[PDB]
Write a protein that binds this ligand. Structure first.
Ligand SMILES: [Zn+2]
Lengths: 585, 577
């Protein structure tokens, strides 16, 4: 109608009143001409700019997408199809015919929702929804425009198609298949090389657990993506998606079909996907030069725990990590550090793990699919692997509670994770290797609840020695009662009846830039201390093996990162040797 | 609605007929059609390089020319009929219903396109993941591996009927012929199966290889359909380059295959350099993982295991294995698993495994998907924590260790002591879960004892701490051989076949008798790994063959036997520390 043309010209005015939009289109046009990969025919519209140019048109997209967006799509397509002559001898007949799609940004107003908050009142509106990608459907091409040649008449022909999804407005459906005869009735010569197809995919978005109240099933919604958005996400990704929330089908309105249970199907026509200082740096490096920065950082860690200085120091060293190496033979050296905690269940283990899990930037909570060697199927039957915490925590940290409760299948898989930093997947028809360079911190408890301090965890907990030897540091804590001292810590509990934001920058910057190497200073210290430990036949937490030498190098390198020195020093080995003795006693 | 496109089939069809008539081998395709005219051939293969050659020939001659290859590239569905139409009228009921011959196009070659200064995008070995919807109806070449092929099934193209009322042959319940349409009475139709047009059809699927997969994704698959004389050109597990027409409001896609193909002085100069350097037997052993401590005699066993022995099919179906089995016992924390990684990395057919089989299906096969042992056929299997394997896991091990089925493997096992820490005062069987039935199947059974000694540990600590400090071993005086050259020499060694002489033949039996008689005291002392049995006689034979084949020798010499006897005797020394 004439109203459709009016809004097409109105959008053309918007594309001209702010040349910052169509000049980027020209940049796309120039780039595409040079590559004779192709940049997408998509631009992002700032709703605030659209708000100040035409309030009704800006509100038109949000409130009435069916009557405003298709006029805007045509105007943008018209601008792109007319800004250049397209002198390509053959590409002008197929490639230049692809329409241009829109994207949106800026203030969404009231249309910023979640799968739970999304209701029937929000239908037929362009809304932004925040959630998680549970799964993705299979990608298939979808016919858009058909091109065919009428050989008998000696001239080509064409036909377009409409779908309930691709058409925001309720246009007449076209279920007809690619035509064989046209109005003239002659058999048509099919032109696949000049027909137009567009890929299509379906995804499911669910409300994030962070805002989910207990006692209700989770809320989910389906989003439709096409063309450039067809393969831009993977399951498990946090996503903010803007699209048209529209219904389809009928709730038994045809014939009688008057059951009270039938409802109308709804989904979102998504068109925009949002997958989810030097002053500090100079302060980070300056603070490293004071002698007590190692201890001060060791006290900001775990403010709710009194004492446990070595454990807090161990957490800092584990975050700093070591340095990996590569060899001319093709071998690689592990650099990361693992920590294990053992003793009475409720005594300060869940408290320490809570702080580390909350503080660390890439901390993953685990308890007894972490092996990442299992598949999940779509609605149509096709299946895809799901990632595991050990794999996801690459270059991160793994937080384990109830480590004693994990199964034997987990133990055999984590053997290669902690030692070779990789997972060798060997399944029926699926074989791959995934990096598992993750630091591990775990807590375990004895069966009886009360730890026998006279014996090692090999008899108090009875985990395999091969599994236990993979932890660089082990700590045993039990609430041995000193009444005046326990009063001091319990007073804060009875009261309930360096800044961390900068510290996380300190940890981030130190590991980001500092890659310490060994020095002759620590070489003698490592050999002498290792030999002395081998000479020491007295009972200890664990026997002395080459892994203890590896731990000393890893710990010394971590201390150098605390000092932010790209070379190790004798003091770093001295600290590591003392700490290992504490862990071995 | 009518539209206009620059495509002109009139020029192309005339060019096709002219190309058929003119393009020489007389004409290449006319000779091919002559053979078909002589009823000697059933299928016609069209070469796009020949078409491109003619186009360049016309281009260089300055005559009229249109990009016929690209037209066939874009719309191969219709040009297939056009070539048939040209042949149906130029080869020396409607015709299409009665044709029994088949036609296919073979792809352009990348050398030809570059030689004619053009880009052959369709023939580029792209993966199935990279095939967008733009390629529907376009002849493209796909590089991948076939994972599933179905059996031959009937594929009727035209269904034939016969009518009682008229006797006409009707092709596609009631006769639609002219006589019955006029007549008030129509003869009912029946299926004349012997007259129906059968086509040979099979279902095939291609899948991406591991290197073609993006980060963390599952390799995608695509459907390949084979028709006509091209059937049985694809089998499961074949890494192939297949050219075909990618064919399809949502549309499912499949591909109709058109062309199917499968996937030294240069190295001798490096071998000459290795011979020039000398010390081949020890240089290779020294080159095996220099970052690992100096277990030279143990790593020598790895060199022979990597080389392997010589198979001997004696006759009457009786078999003697050509593989070498070595065990690596030792206490935990000595990082002995790194050698298992090194050997598996070095071997081109090595499979690595830890503890019990992965989900049980790691051994044997599942509903068949073979396990690790089947995967390492004609290769090497490295196992860490062998003793922890289940009875079923070890049961499959014994059969492979005895029958090599295929699961032709060289077994390198590493296992921690059963008690966590070793006790030299006890027998090796007491300190391990494995019994004598499996250990007797091994060739070399070296034991590692993590004995705390200030002398030895001082060197090992200095050795390891330098490996972390510098990217090379502290023995910088030695230049190790790169793994590719190490692999190449092993492959070069694998081609050789040393044979025993009568001089060494008497020496072998003399050493065997000498060692066997004295080994009675070793077992009587109960302080030795095992009694001397024909495992020692045949073990030396395999090792001597390996050593002689390691030296590229055409015949076996005495020094190989003595060196083999040396290593066997060296292995016992670990029990006496
Ligand atoms: Zn009839």
């Amino acid at each position: 109608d004439a109203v459709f043309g009016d809004r097409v010209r109105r959008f053309q005015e918007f594309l001209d009143t702010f040349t910052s939009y169509r000049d980027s289109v020209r940049s796309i046009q120039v780039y595409n001409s040079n590559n004779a990969n192709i940049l997408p025919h998509r631009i992002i519209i700032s709703l605030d700019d659209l708000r100040e140019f035409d309030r009704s048109f800006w509100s038109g997209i949000l409130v009435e997408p069916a009557y405003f967006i298709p006029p805007a799509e045509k105007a943008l397509t018209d601008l792109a199809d007319s800004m250049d002559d397209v002198p390509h001898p053959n590409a002008s007949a197929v490639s230049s015919r692809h329409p241009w799609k829109l994207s949106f940004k800026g203030s969404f107003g009231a249309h910023a929702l979640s799968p739970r908050t999304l209701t029937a009142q929000h239908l037929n509106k362009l809304v932004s929804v925040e959630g998680i990608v549970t799964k993705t459907s299979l990608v298939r091409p979808k016919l858009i425009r058909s091109v065919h040649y009428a050989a008998k008449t000696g001239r080509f022909h064409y036909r377009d198609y409409t779908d309930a999804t691709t058409t925001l407005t309720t246009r007449i459906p076209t279920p007809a298949i690619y035509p064989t005869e046209d109005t003239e009735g002659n058999k048509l010569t099919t032109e696949y090389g000049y027909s137009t197809f567009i890929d299509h995919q379906r995804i499911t978005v669910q409300e994030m657990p962070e805002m989910a109240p207990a006692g209700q099933l989770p809320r989910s919604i389906d989003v439709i993506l096409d063309d450039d958005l067809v393969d831009k996400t993977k399951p498990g990704d946090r996503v903010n998606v803007v699209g048209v929330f529209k219904s389809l089908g009928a709730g038994g309105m045809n014939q009688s079909n008057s059951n009270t249970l039938i409802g109308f199907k709804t989904l979102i026509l998504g068109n925009t996907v949002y997958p989810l200082t030097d002053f500090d740096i100079r302060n980070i490096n300056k603070l490293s030069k004071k002698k007590d920065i190692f201890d001060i950082l060791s006290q900001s860690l775990a403010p709710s725990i009194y004492g446990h200085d070595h454990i807090k120091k161990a957490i800092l060293l584990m975050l700093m990590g070591g340095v990996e190496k590569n060899l001319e033979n093709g071998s690689h050296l592990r650099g990361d550090i693992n920590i294990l905690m053992v003793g009475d269940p409720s005594t300060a283990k869940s408290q320490l793990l809570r702080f580390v899990l909350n503080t660390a930037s890439l901390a993953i909570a685990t308890t007894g699919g972490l092996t990442a060697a299992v598949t999940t199927d779509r609605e149509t039957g096709e299946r895809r692997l799901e990632a595991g915490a050990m794999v996801l925590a690459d270059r991160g940290v793994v937080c384990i509670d109830e480590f004693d409760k994990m199964t034997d299948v987990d133990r055999v898989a984590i053997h290669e994770v902690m030692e070779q930093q990789t997972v060798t997947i060997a399944k029926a028809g699926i074989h791959t290797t995934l990096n598992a360079r993750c630091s591990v911190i775990a807590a375990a408890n004895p069966v009886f609840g009360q730890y026998d301090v006279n014996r090692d965890p090999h008899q108090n907990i009875a985990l395999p020695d091969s599994l236990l030897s993979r932890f660089d540091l082990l700590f045993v804590v039990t609430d041995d009662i000193n009444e005046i001292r326990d009063r001091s810590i319990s007073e804060h509990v009875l009261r309930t009846h360096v800044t961390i934001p900068f510290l996380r920058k300190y940890v981030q910057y130190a590991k980001e830039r500092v890659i310490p190497q060994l020095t002759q200073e620590a070489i003698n210290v490592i050999v002498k201390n290792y030999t002395d430990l081998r000479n020491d036949d007295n009972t200890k937490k664990s026997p002395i093996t080459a892994r203890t030498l590896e731990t000393l190098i890893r710990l010394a390198t971590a201390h150098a990162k605390v000092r932010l020195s790209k070379t190790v020093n004798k003091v770093d080995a001295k600290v590591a040797a003392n700490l290992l003795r504490f862990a071995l006693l | 609605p009518s539209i206009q496109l620059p495509v002109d089939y009139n020029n192309l069809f005339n060019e096709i007929t002219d190309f058929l008539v003119t393009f020489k081998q007389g004409p290449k395709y006319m000779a091919m059609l002559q053979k078909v005219a002589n009823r000697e051939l059933n299928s016609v293969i069209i070469d796009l390089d020949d078409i491109l050659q003619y186009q360049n020939e016309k281009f260089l001659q300055g005559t009229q020319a249109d990009d016929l290859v690209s037209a066939i590239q874009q719309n191969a569905n219709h040009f297939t009929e056009l070539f048939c139409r040209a042949i149906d009228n130029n080869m020396p009921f409607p015709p299409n219903l009665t044709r029994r011959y088949f036609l296919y196009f073979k792809p352009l070659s990348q050398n030809c396109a570059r030689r004619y200064r053009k880009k052959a995008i369709s023939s580029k070995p792209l993966s199935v993941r990279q095939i967008k919807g733009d390629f529907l109806g376009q002849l493209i070449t796909v590089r991948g591996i076939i994972t599933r092929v179905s059996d031959v099934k009937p594929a009727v193209e035209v269904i034939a009927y016969t009518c009682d009322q008229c006797g006409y042959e009707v092709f596609q319940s009631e006769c639609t012929s002219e006589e019955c349409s006029q007549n008030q009475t129509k003869g009912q139709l029946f299926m004349s199966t012997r007259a129906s047009k059968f086509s040979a059809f099979q279902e095939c699927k291609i899948q991406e290889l591991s290197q073609q997969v993006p980060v963390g994704h599952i390799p995608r698959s695509l459907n390949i359909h084979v028709n006509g004389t091209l059937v049985r050109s694809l089998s499961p597990g074949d890494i192939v380059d297949v050219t075909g027409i990618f064919l399809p409001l949502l549309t499912e896609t499949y591909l109709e295959a058109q062309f199917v193909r499968q996937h030294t002085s240069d190295v001798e100069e490096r071998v000459m350099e290795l011979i020039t350097s000398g010390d081949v037997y020890n240089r290779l052993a020294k080159s095996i993982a220099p970052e690992i401590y100096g277990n030279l005699d143990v790593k020598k066993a790895l060199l022979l295991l990597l080389v392997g022995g010589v198979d001997k099919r004696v006759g009457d179906g009786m078999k003697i294995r050509g593989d070498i089995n070595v065990c690596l016992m030792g206490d935990p924390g000595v990082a002995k698993s790194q050698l298992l990684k090194a050997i598996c990395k070095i071997s081109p057919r090595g499979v690595y495994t830890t503890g019990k089989g992965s989900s049980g299906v790691g051994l044997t096969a599942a509903v068949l998907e073979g396990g690790a042992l089947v995967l390492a056929d004609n290769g090497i299997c490295c196992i860490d924590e062998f003793d922890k394997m289940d009875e079923s896991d070890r049961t499959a091990i014994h059969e492979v260790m005895e029958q090599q089925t295929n699961a032709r493997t060289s077994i390198l096992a590493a296992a921690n002591p059963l008690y966590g820490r070793y006790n030299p005062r006890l027998s090796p069987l007491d300190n391990i879960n494995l019994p004598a039935a499996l250990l007797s199947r091994f060739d070399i059974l070296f034991l590692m004892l993590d004995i705390p000694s200030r002398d030895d540990d001082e060197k090992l600590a200095e050795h390891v701490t330098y490996v972390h400090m510098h990217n090379k071993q502290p023995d910088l005086d030695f230049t190790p051989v790169e793994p590719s050259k190490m692999r190449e020499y092993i492959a070069y060694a694998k081609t050789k076949r040393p044979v025993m002489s009568e001089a060494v033949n008497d020496y072998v039996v003399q050493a065997y008798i000498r060692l066997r008689q004295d080994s009675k005291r070793e077992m009587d002392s109960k302080f030795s790994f095992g009694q001397a049995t024909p495992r020692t006689l045949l073990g030396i034979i395999r090792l001597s063959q390996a050593l002689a084949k390691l030296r590229l020798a055409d015949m076996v010499d005495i020094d190989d036997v003595e060196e083999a006897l040396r290593l066997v005797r060296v292995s016992k020394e670990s029990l006496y520390q």
